[PDB]
Design a binder for this molecule. Structure first.
Ligand code: CL
Ligand code: CL
Ligand code: CL
Ligand code: CL
Ligand code: NA
Ligand code: NA
Ligand code: ZN
Ligand code: ZN
Lengths: 312, 312
């Protein structure tokens, strides 16, 4: 027999003594060592003193998992470890000053998400994400990518959606101060104001142009007639403007970054465009520079702080 | 010669090749390995591939240090490493469900500070503090204690002040939402309202009683005459009420925790009192329980969320 440590966060360690003739599963249940599933593996002499991840099956581990990951779903740790086995094998090159991801397992949506996070002001709340994102920016993004997949209930290889992924991440971020007030003008119903906070204050679906959002966009009223919705006030470090993919021109110096999607829900591919001294198309490990850019844009990010309209 | 890594955060590693005949100082300047000062030590065969801390002497390291520690003082890392050499030797026992510190090097002010942090809602901003505090709550508080000393410009062994220490820590915490409005009534000058935000909104010096703060305390007006200051509105997860040490009775169930100071500035000692099912005096590694408590109290912490006065 040998002494090991079990954990859910690699910080709070629990001592265990295991029988070398039984599998780690019969004793601990699902068990992982350095991201490898050892549930059906019998203890080995070379395992002594090492640290093993396990599913939170007692209340002490559940609280530790909740404190570290900010979720109560007990299967989260297993989803995280399963994804991590693959993401450790991905490559995370520095492209145009940012940590990207070499293409693998249909991971283009994760790369453009990661590239985007490095260009907007966003702080994560869960300790696990705080630690994984700091390492991700340093070029070791395996844990961060595996966490994203676990939080989004996606498995490695699944085609992903950036806007939906950013939505999950934003929920685990500090957007407390963010505020948005909108006005819908229906010349039959009048003016109807709304106020949004948190993630609803930074995400909008329907138009890519922040400026058109301020001038006014045509959207059906609650009565069904065509009305006009325009931005009254915004208080945020950034705004995410999304719309179904359609040909769209990205003007240099008028946005921060954007996501391009080519394909459909069974097969497609994301590319990332960022406005630096010139437009740069970051395509995983590939990089292309252009004076102008046009393509099927689906998300556009803009920097903000405080905006108040002038419309009466 | 050998290959090593230099760092300021143990995450961003920089490869180096060192001559085994020169000291790490002549090549890197101040150098630390696992918290030990190796500046005057010549490289050894057993050092190959290991990670060394160095002072940020180029702009790449300076930015990394700033991102990790949220300070631009270049000597911070040296102060942190010097303190860490000692705090690694301290003991961090679990007392009354909290991570305390066995007494050493006049560290009572650090223990009551640490005990207090585990009982109030507070999130740190610097990655270094986020990581060290999470480990501190797990019983490995050496790095967290060493960071406190570095941030407060205190060395191991120096007598410390809890209120001043909490002030430094609060600056590196998210108190954005915190707000306090006060009213001073001088029957000669009238009503004069003030609004405080951030750390000024949670800390007050002059009285230990939050309730007396709401009823009104006698404090000189700006004109010099005696006036009355009372709490108009508070928006915070907690408030810290401090006053010069004086005999004071701590009533069970009417506060969260408090600091007791016995002595003076050349020699003294802190004790921590917390209100659980009964009053508990946590004295480093020592623990005492009592139905009632009285002593030279100097800080008292209370839980809050939203308070609006009723005074006209
Ligand atoms: Cl790392
Ligand atoms: Cl922008
Ligand atoms: Cl640790
Ligand atoms: Cl209280
Ligand atoms: Na960012
Ligand atoms: Na706390
Ligand atoms: Zn209408
Ligand atoms: Zn006066």
């Amino acid at each position: 027999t040998i002494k090991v440590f079990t954990t859910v966060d690699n910080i709070n360690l629990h001592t265990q003594v295991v029988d070398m003739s039984m599998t780690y599963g019969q004793q601990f249940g699902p068990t992982y060592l350095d991201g490898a599933d050892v549930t059906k593996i019998k203890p080995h002499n070379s395992h002594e003193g090492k640290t093993f991840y396990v599913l939170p099956n007692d209340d002490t581990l559940r609280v530790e998992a909740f404190e570290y990951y900010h979720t109560t779903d007990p299967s989260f740790l297993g989803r995280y470890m399963s994804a991590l086995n693959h993401t450790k094998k991905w490559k995370y090159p520095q492209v145009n000053g940012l940590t990207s991801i070499k293409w693998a397992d249909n991971n283009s949506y994760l790369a453009t998400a990661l590239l985007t996070l490095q260009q907007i002001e966003l702080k994560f709340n869960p300790p696990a994400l705080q630690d994984a994102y700091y390492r991700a920016r340093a070029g070791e993004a395996a844990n961060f990518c595996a966490l994203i997949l676990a939080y989004c209930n996606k498995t490695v290889g699944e085609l992903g959606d950036v806007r939906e992924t950013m939505s999950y991440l934003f929920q685990h971020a500090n957007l407390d101060s963010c505020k948005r007030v909108l006005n819908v003008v229906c010349d039959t119903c009048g003016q109807q104001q709304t106020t949004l906070k948190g993630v609803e204050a930074v995400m909008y679906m329907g138009t890519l142009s922040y400026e058109q959002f301020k001038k006014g966009v045509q959207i059906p009223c609650t009565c069904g007639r065509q009305a006009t919705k325009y931005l009254v006030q915004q208080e945020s470090p950034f705004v995410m403007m999304s719309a179904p993919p359609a040909q769209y021109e990205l003007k240099h110096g008028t946005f921060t970054c954007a996501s391009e999607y080519t394909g459909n829900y069974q097969c497609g591919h994301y590319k990332h465009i960022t406005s630096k001294e010139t437009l740069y198309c970051i395509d995983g490990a590939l990089l292309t520079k252009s004076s102008e850019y046009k393509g099927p844009i689906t998300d556009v990010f803009y920097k903000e702080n405080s905006y108040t309209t002038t419309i009466k």
